[PDB]
Design an enzyme around this catalytic site. Structure first.
Site, PDB file in Angstrom:
ATOM      1  N   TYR A  15      16.796 -20.125   3.361  1.00 41.91           N
ATOM      2  CA  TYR A  15      17.345 -18.846   2.273  1.00 41.91           C
ATOM      3  C   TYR A  15      16.599 -18.116   2.174  1.00 41.91           C
ATOM      4  CZ  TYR A  15      17.546 -17.237  -2.667  1.00 41.91           C
ATOM      5  OH  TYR A  15      17.162 -16.725  -3.685  1.00 41.91           O
ATOM      6  N   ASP A  39      14.769 -15.729 -12.713  1.00 51.05           N
ATOM      7  CA  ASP A  39      14.399 -14.702 -12.296  1.00 51.05           C
ATOM      8  C   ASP A  39      13.557 -12.947 -12.672  1.00 51.05           C
ATOM      9  OD1 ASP A  39      13.044 -12.839 -10.614  1.00 51.05           O
ATOM     10  OD2 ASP A  39      13.495 -14.030  -8.347  1.00 51.05           O
ATOM     11  N   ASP A  96       5.117 -11.293  -4.577  1.00 52.65           N
ATOM     12  CA  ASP A  96       4.357 -12.451  -4.564  1.00 52.65           C
ATOM     13  C   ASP A  96       5.104 -13.860  -5.161  1.00 52.65           C
ATOM     14  OD1 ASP A  96       2.158 -13.016  -1.437  1.00 52.65           O
ATOM     15  OD2 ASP A  96       1.679 -11.960  -3.172  1.00 52.65           O
ATOM     16  N   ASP A  99       9.336 -19.724  -5.622  1.00 56.30           N
ATOM     17  CA  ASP A  99       9.683 -20.372  -6.316  1.00 56.30           C
ATOM     18  C   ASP A  99      10.346 -22.320  -6.318  1.00 56.30           C
ATOM     19  OD1 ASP A  99      11.257 -17.426  -5.956  1.00 56.30           O
ATOM     20  OD2 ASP A  99      13.465 -18.405  -5.284  1.00 56.30           O
TER      21      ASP A  99
END
EC number: 5.3.3.1
Lengths: 123, 123
Positions: A15, A39, A96, A99
């Site tokens: 990914y 997100d 930074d 996930d």
């Protein structure tokens, strides 16, 4: 199937690969047809490939790299640290993120959540 | 209060500090009286200071360090990468974990979840 700890690491590394090249179609295809994305974490989620494709077209002249190993569990879950180096309004900045993803019985990303805020930005 | 993105970063950095020195009492006190811990993520959770104190006494001749920034959000959540360097049955090993914590309105850790498996062990 439900990814093994080892497969989850490979999928997640993959990914960051896709995001680095900006192959939006391949990314969207890594998701489940009805996945949700959060997100940054704390904002309402986006649901579906349609919306997520939109979400990704909007964000990618970027390069992303893993800045540490992918931590994976045995229940189809994983988390990972990485940096996004952009160039904001002429000014180059870095973000930074961390996930946390959950895969389904097909190896697709059921849900993604990104943890970051302006405290992680270096502009 | 509910930590600000900035406070969450400081609390989490503090937590790796406590684990490094092995001050078990100070760690347990960072938690809420009825927090739950999921370590490794995928196993049943441990609930309460009693159980968590037990859980931490059992694990700590270790040193832990942050191997990347603490990713924090604005909703009292944060995640962070770090390494645990132990010495297993004479043999020294290292474990790379990723913790995701959620604080409450008092700045205490309501819930902690660790992401790791034998794929993150380097023995």
């Amino acid at each position: 199937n439900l990814p093994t700890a080892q497969e989850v690491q490979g999928l997640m590394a993959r990914y960051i690969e896709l995001v680095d090249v900006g192959d939006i179609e391949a990314i969207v295809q890594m998701y489940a047809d009805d996945a949700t994305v959060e997100d940054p974490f704390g904002q309402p989620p986006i649901h579906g490939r349609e919306q997520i494709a939109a979400f990704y077209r909007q964000g990618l002249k970027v390069r992303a790299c893993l800045t540490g190993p992918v931590a994976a569990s045995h229940n189809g879950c994983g988390a990972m640290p990485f940096r996004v180096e952009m160039v904001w309004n002429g000014q180059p900045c870095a973000l930074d993120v961390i996930d946390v993803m959950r895969f389904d019985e097909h190896g697709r990303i059921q849900t993604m959540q990104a943890y970051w805020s302006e405290v992680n930005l270096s502009v």
